Amino acid sequence: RQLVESGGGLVHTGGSLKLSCVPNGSIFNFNPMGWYRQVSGQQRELVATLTRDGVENYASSVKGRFTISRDSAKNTLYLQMTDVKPGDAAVYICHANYRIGRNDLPVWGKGTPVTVSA
Amino acid sequence: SAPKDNTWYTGAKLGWSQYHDTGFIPNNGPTHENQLGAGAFGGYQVNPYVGFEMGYDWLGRMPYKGDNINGAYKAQGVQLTAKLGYPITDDLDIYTRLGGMVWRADTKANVPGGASFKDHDTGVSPVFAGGVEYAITPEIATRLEYQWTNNIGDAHTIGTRPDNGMLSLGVSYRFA
Protein backbone atom coordinates (compact mmCIF):
# COMPACT_ATOMS: atom_id res chain seq x y z
CA ARG A 1 0.00 0.00 0.00
CA GLN A 2 2.99 2.28 -0.71
CA LEU A 3 2.33 3.43 -4.29
CA VAL A 4 -1.42 3.91 -5.17
CA GLU A 5 -2.34 4.34 -8.86
CA SER A 6 -5.54 5.63 -10.49
CA GLY A 7 -6.98 6.69 -13.85
CA GLY A 8 -6.72 3.95 -16.56
CA GLY A 9 -9.53 2.18 -18.51
CA LEU A 10 -10.47 2.30 -22.21
CA VAL A 11 -8.89 4.68 -24.75
CA HIS A 12 -9.32 4.82 -28.55
CA THR A 13 -6.33 4.57 -30.94
CA GLY A 14 -4.66 8.01 -31.28
CA GLY A 15 -6.49 9.14 -28.09
CA SER A 16 -5.08 10.38 -24.76
CA LEU A 17 -5.09 9.54 -21.02
CA LYS A 18 -3.68 10.74 -17.67
CA LEU A 19 -2.56 8.21 -15.06
CA SER A 20 -1.79 9.31 -11.48
CA CYS A 21 0.13 7.66 -8.55
CA VAL A 22 0.29 8.99 -4.93
CA PRO A 23 3.05 7.57 -2.64
CA ASN A 24 3.01 6.70 1.15
CA GLY A 25 4.83 9.72 2.52
CA SER A 26 6.51 12.19 0.19
CA ILE A 27 7.69 12.45 -3.39
CA PHE A 28 11.41 13.49 -3.15
CA ASN A 29 11.88 10.57 -0.69
CA PHE A 30 12.65 8.79 -3.98
CA ASN A 31 15.14 9.05 -6.82
CA PRO A 32 13.97 8.35 -9.51
CA MET A 33 10.23 7.81 -9.59
CA GLY A 34 8.79 6.22 -12.77
CA TRP A 35 6.20 4.19 -14.66
CA TYR A 36 6.53 0.67 -16.05
CA ARG A 37 4.08 -1.40 -18.14
CA GLN A 38 3.38 -5.14 -18.16
CA VAL A 39 1.27 -7.44 -20.41
CA SER A 40 0.14 -10.63 -18.64
CA GLY A 41 3.31 -12.71 -18.04
CA GLN A 42 5.63 -10.63 -20.32
CA GLN A 43 8.46 -8.54 -18.80
CA ARG A 44 7.98 -5.12 -17.14
CA GLU A 45 8.90 -2.49 -19.78
CA LEU A 46 10.25 0.74 -18.30
CA VAL A 47 8.05 3.55 -19.71
CA ALA A 48 9.45 6.76 -18.13
CA THR A 49 11.41 8.11 -15.10
CA LEU A 50 11.79 11.42 -13.26
CA THR A 51 14.77 12.26 -10.99
CA ARG A 52 14.57 14.22 -7.68
CA ASP A 53 16.13 17.15 -9.63
CA GLY A 54 13.26 16.82 -12.21
CA VAL A 55 15.27 15.40 -15.15
CA GLU A 56 13.04 13.13 -17.32
CA ASN A 57 13.82 9.96 -19.34
CA TYR A 58 11.68 7.79 -21.66
CA ALA A 59 11.76 4.45 -23.48
CA SER A 60 12.12 4.86 -27.28
CA SER A 61 8.68 3.15 -27.75
CA VAL A 62 6.90 6.15 -26.06
CA LYS A 63 9.31 9.13 -26.51
CA GLY A 64 7.44 12.23 -27.79
CA ARG A 65 4.00 10.54 -27.25
CA PHE A 66 3.97 10.08 -23.45
CA THR A 67 5.15 12.62 -20.84
CA ILE A 68 6.09 12.18 -17.13
CA SER A 69 5.39 14.85 -14.48
CA ARG A 70 4.64 15.50 -10.77
CA ASP A 71 2.89 18.02 -8.53
CA SER A 72 4.51 18.35 -5.09
CA ALA A 73 1.51 20.17 -3.56
CA LYS A 74 -0.69 17.20 -4.65
CA ASN A 75 2.05 14.65 -3.75
CA THR A 76 1.25 13.03 -7.14
CA LEU A 77 3.22 11.57 -10.07
CA TYR A 78 1.44 11.61 -13.48
CA LEU A 79 1.81 9.81 -16.80
CA GLN A 80 0.18 11.70 -19.66
CA MET A 81 -0.28 9.44 -22.69
CA THR A 82 -1.19 10.88 -26.10
CA ASP A 83 -1.23 9.39 -29.62
CA VAL A 84 -1.95 5.95 -28.07
CA LYS A 85 -1.11 2.97 -30.36
CA PRO A 86 -2.68 -0.53 -29.90
CA GLY A 87 0.84 -1.56 -28.74
CA ASP A 88 0.41 0.66 -25.62
CA ALA A 89 -2.33 -1.44 -23.93
CA ALA A 90 -0.96 -2.86 -20.64
CA VAL A 91 -1.20 -2.77 -16.86
CA TYR A 92 0.71 0.44 -16.05
CA ILE A 93 2.60 0.32 -12.74
CA CYS A 94 4.03 3.14 -10.57
CA HIS A 95 7.68 2.72 -9.40
CA ALA A 96 9.69 4.55 -6.69
CA ASN A 97 13.34 3.99 -5.69
CA TYR A 98 14.80 4.89 -2.27
CA ARG A 99 18.54 5.67 -2.80
CA ILE A 100 20.31 4.88 0.52
CA GLY A 101 24.04 5.48 -0.06
CA ARG A 102 25.20 2.69 -2.43
CA ASN A 103 21.93 0.76 -1.85
CA ASP A 104 18.82 0.98 -4.08
CA LEU A 105 15.51 -0.06 -2.51
CA PRO A 106 12.59 -0.28 -5.01
CA VAL A 107 8.85 0.19 -4.38
CA TRP A 108 6.12 -1.12 -6.78
CA GLY A 109 2.33 -0.62 -7.11
CA LYS A 110 -0.33 -3.19 -8.16
CA GLY A 111 -0.76 -1.18 -11.38
CA THR A 112 -3.82 0.11 -13.29
CA PRO A 113 -5.21 -1.40 -16.55
CA VAL A 114 -5.12 0.54 -19.87
CA THR A 115 -7.05 -1.01 -22.81
CA VAL A 116 -7.09 0.24 -26.42
CA SER A 117 -9.84 0.20 -29.10
CA ALA A 118 -9.22 0.48 -32.86
CA SER B 1 44.57 8.12 43.65
CA ALA B 2 45.47 7.77 39.97
CA PRO B 3 46.82 4.17 39.67
CA LYS B 4 50.40 3.70 40.94
CA ASP B 5 53.19 4.31 38.38
CA ASN B 6 53.71 1.46 35.87
CA THR B 7 50.45 -0.38 36.78
CA TRP B 8 47.89 -2.22 34.68
CA TYR B 9 44.12 -2.00 35.05
CA THR B 10 41.03 -3.60 33.50
CA GLY B 11 37.38 -2.53 33.64
CA ALA B 12 33.91 -2.41 32.15
CA LYS B 13 31.27 0.27 31.53
CA LEU B 14 27.54 0.67 31.01
CA GLY B 15 26.04 3.83 29.57
CA TRP B 16 23.30 5.92 28.08
CA SER B 17 24.21 6.05 24.38
CA GLN B 18 22.64 8.64 22.07
CA TYR B 19 23.30 9.10 18.35
CA HIS B 20 23.24 12.52 16.64
CA ASP B 21 23.13 13.68 12.90
CA THR B 22 21.07 10.53 12.33
CA GLY B 23 19.95 11.06 8.69
CA PHE B 24 19.45 7.71 6.94
CA ILE B 25 15.90 6.88 5.71
CA PRO B 26 12.72 9.06 5.43
CA ASN B 27 10.74 6.86 7.89
CA ASN B 28 7.32 8.20 9.04
CA GLY B 29 7.49 6.68 12.59
CA PRO B 30 9.56 7.27 15.75
CA THR B 31 13.31 6.79 16.09
CA HIS B 32 14.58 5.54 19.45
CA GLU B 33 17.68 7.66 19.94
CA ASN B 34 18.51 6.71 23.56
CA GLN B 35 19.98 3.20 23.87
CA LEU B 36 22.06 1.11 26.26
CA GLY B 37 25.76 1.27 25.40
CA ALA B 38 28.38 -1.02 26.91
CA GLY B 39 32.12 -1.61 26.82
CA ALA B 40 35.24 -3.29 28.11
CA PHE B 41 38.58 -1.54 28.59
CA GLY B 42 42.11 -2.08 29.83
CA GLY B 43 45.00 0.27 30.36
CA TYR B 44 48.40 1.10 31.69
CA GLN B 45 49.15 4.08 33.93
CA VAL B 46 52.55 5.72 33.32
CA ASN B 47 52.43 8.31 36.11
CA PRO B 48 49.63 10.07 38.16
CA TYR B 49 48.78 12.28 35.13
CA VAL B 50 49.27 9.99 32.08
CA GLY B 51 47.85 6.63 31.06
CA PHE B 52 46.93 4.76 27.89
CA GLU B 53 43.86 2.59 27.47
CA MET B 54 42.24 0.38 24.88
CA GLY B 55 38.63 -0.78 24.80
CA TYR B 56 35.74 -2.27 22.90
CA ASP B 57 32.46 -0.32 22.75
CA TRP B 58 28.99 -1.48 21.82
CA LEU B 59 27.26 1.82 20.92
CA GLY B 60 23.70 0.39 20.70
CA ARG B 61 21.10 -0.27 17.97
CA MET B 62 18.90 2.62 16.80
CA PRO B 63 15.58 1.55 15.17
CA TYR B 64 14.00 3.76 12.48
CA LYS B 65 10.27 2.84 12.74
CA GLY B 66 7.68 3.47 9.98
CA ASP B 67 5.01 2.03 7.59
CA ASN B 68 6.52 3.51 4.35
CA ILE B 69 10.10 2.50 5.11
CA ASN B 70 11.73 1.20 8.31
CA GLY B 71 15.17 -0.04 9.34
CA ALA B 72 18.01 0.14 11.86
CA TYR B 73 21.59 1.28 12.43
CA LYS B 74 24.10 -0.12 14.95
CA ALA B 75 27.76 0.51 15.62
CA GLN B 76 30.61 -0.84 17.69
CA GLY B 77 34.37 -0.51 17.67
CA VAL B 78 37.80 -0.81 19.20
CA GLN B 79 39.33 2.38 20.61
CA LEU B 80 42.77 3.45 21.78
CA THR B 81 43.21 6.64 23.83
CA ALA B 82 45.60 8.56 26.00
CA LYS B 83 44.08 9.49 29.40
CA LEU B 84 45.28 12.81 30.80
CA GLY B 85 44.26 13.33 34.44
CA TYR B 86 44.45 16.04 37.08
CA PRO B 87 44.20 14.96 40.77
CA ILE B 88 41.58 17.59 41.74
CA THR B 89 41.74 16.01 45.23
CA ASP B 90 43.98 13.39 46.77
CA ASP B 91 41.15 10.77 46.13
CA LEU B 92 39.28 12.17 43.05
CA ASP B 93 40.72 12.67 39.54
CA ILE B 94 39.25 14.64 36.67
CA TYR B 95 40.40 13.51 33.21
CA THR B 96 40.16 13.72 29.44
CA ARG B 97 40.64 10.85 26.96
CA LEU B 98 41.96 11.51 23.47
CA GLY B 99 42.47 9.10 20.57
CA GLY B 100 40.49 7.16 17.98
CA MET B 101 38.14 4.28 17.24
CA VAL B 102 38.16 1.66 14.52
CA TRP B 103 34.44 1.12 13.99
CA ARG B 104 32.01 -1.18 12.28
CA ALA B 105 28.56 0.19 11.50
CA ASP B 106 25.68 -1.89 10.11
CA THR B 107 22.43 -0.70 8.50
CA LYS B 108 19.23 -2.28 7.25
CA ALA B 109 16.03 -1.03 5.66
CA ASN B 110 12.83 -2.59 4.28
CA VAL B 111 9.59 -1.37 2.70
CA PRO B 112 6.60 -3.08 4.41
CA GLY B 113 5.19 -5.80 2.06
CA GLY B 114 8.19 -5.12 -0.26
CA ALA B 115 11.98 -5.11 -0.73
CA SER B 116 14.88 -4.92 1.79
CA PHE B 117 18.68 -4.59 2.13
CA LYS B 118 21.50 -4.99 4.68
CA ASP B 119 24.83 -3.15 4.47
CA HIS B 120 27.89 -2.49 6.63
CA ASP B 121 31.05 -0.39 6.60
CA THR B 122 34.30 0.04 8.52
CA GLY B 123 36.34 3.18 9.17
CA VAL B 124 38.14 5.32 11.75
CA SER B 125 36.83 8.19 13.88
CA PRO B 126 38.16 10.57 16.54
CA VAL B 127 37.28 9.90 20.23
CA PHE B 128 37.12 12.51 22.94
CA ALA B 129 35.94 11.95 26.51
CA GLY B 130 35.82 13.83 29.79
CA GLY B 131 35.06 12.43 33.24
CA VAL B 132 35.89 11.96 36.90
CA GLU B 133 37.36 8.92 38.59
CA TYR B 134 37.14 8.03 42.30
CA ALA B 135 39.32 5.41 44.01
CA ILE B 136 37.00 3.33 46.26
CA THR B 137 39.88 1.08 47.36
CA PRO B 138 43.52 0.83 46.19
CA GLU B 139 42.29 -1.93 43.83
CA ILE B 140 38.87 -0.53 42.73
CA ALA B 141 37.90 2.76 41.09
CA THR B 142 34.72 4.11 39.46
CA ARG B 143 34.41 6.48 36.48
CA LEU B 144 31.67 8.77 35.32
CA GLU B 145 32.40 10.07 31.81
CA TYR B 146 30.93 11.38 28.60
CA GLN B 147 32.45 9.95 25.39
CA TRP B 148 31.99 11.68 22.04
CA THR B 149 32.82 9.77 18.79
CA ASN B 150 32.52 11.54 15.37
CA ASN B 151 31.30 10.38 11.90
CA ILE B 152 30.56 6.68 12.56
CA GLY B 153 29.77 5.77 8.94
CA ASP B 154 29.80 6.98 5.32
CA ALA B 155 26.86 8.56 3.44
CA HIS B 156 28.06 7.07 0.14
CA THR B 157 28.03 3.45 1.47
CA ILE B 158 25.57 2.54 4.38
CA GLY B 159 23.73 5.87 3.85
CA THR B 160 24.44 7.52 7.26
CA ARG B 161 27.43 8.87 9.27
CA PRO B 162 26.01 9.62 12.69
CA ASP B 163 27.91 10.92 15.73
CA ASN B 164 27.67 9.16 19.12
CA GLY B 165 27.53 10.62 22.60
CA MET B 166 27.71 8.20 25.54
CA LEU B 167 27.37 8.95 29.25
CA SER B 168 28.71 5.97 31.18
CA LEU B 169 29.49 4.57 34.58
CA GLY B 170 32.58 2.37 34.63
CA VAL B 171 34.41 0.23 37.17
CA SER B 172 38.05 -0.90 37.06
CA TYR B 173 40.43 -3.26 38.91
CA ARG B 174 44.13 -2.31 39.38
CA PHE B 175 46.93 -4.95 39.22
CA ALA B 176 49.33 -2.91 41.40
Q: How far is A104 from chain B (nearest CA, A)?
A: 8
Per the structure, the complete domain to which residue B64 belongs is given by 7-19+36-138+147-174
B71: in domain: yes
How do strand A33-38 and strand A17-23 relate by DSSP bridges?
Answer: unpaired
Cα of A22 vs its chain's centroid, Å: 11
Report how far residue A59's alpha carbon sits from residue A62's, in angstroms, rounded to the nearest whole number: 6
Cα of A57 vs its chain's centroid, Å: 12
Dihedral sign for Cα B22, B124, B155, A100, please: negative
Q: How far is A84 from chain B (nearest CA, A)?
A: 32
Name the experimental technique. Answer: X-ray
A26 contacts in chain B (CB < 8 Å): 26
- Which residue of chain B has the CA closest to A100? B159
- Number of domains forming the structure of chain A: 1
Q: How far is B35 from chain A (nearest CA, A)?
A: 23
B24: in domain: no
How do strand B92-110 and strand B70-86 relate by DSSP bridges?
Answer: antiparallel
Annotated resolution, angstroms: 2.3
- Number of domains forming the structure of chain B: 1
For residue B150, count CB atoms less than 10 angstroms from its CB and return exposed for 0-12, middle for 13-18, buried for 19 or more: middle
Residue A36 sits in a domain of what CATH number? 2.60.40.10
Give Cβ neighbours of residue B126 (< 8 Å, ≥ 6 apart).
Answer: B99, B100, B101, B149, B150
Residue B41 sits in a domain of what CATH number? 2.40.160.20
- Which residue of chain B has the CA closest to A96? B111
B50: in domain: yes
How do strand B50-64 and strand B7-20 relate by DSSP bridges?
Answer: unpaired
> Contact, A66 vs A84, CB < 8 A?
no
B61: in domain: yes
Q: Which of B26, B112, B113 sits opposite A29 (nearest CB)?
A: B26
B25: in domain: no
Per the structure, the complete domain to which residue A48 belongs is given by 3-117
User: Using the 8-state DSSP alphabet, how is residue B159 labeled?
Assistant: S
Residues from A contacting B (CB-CB < 8 Å) are 1-2, 23-26, 29, 98, 100-103, 105-108
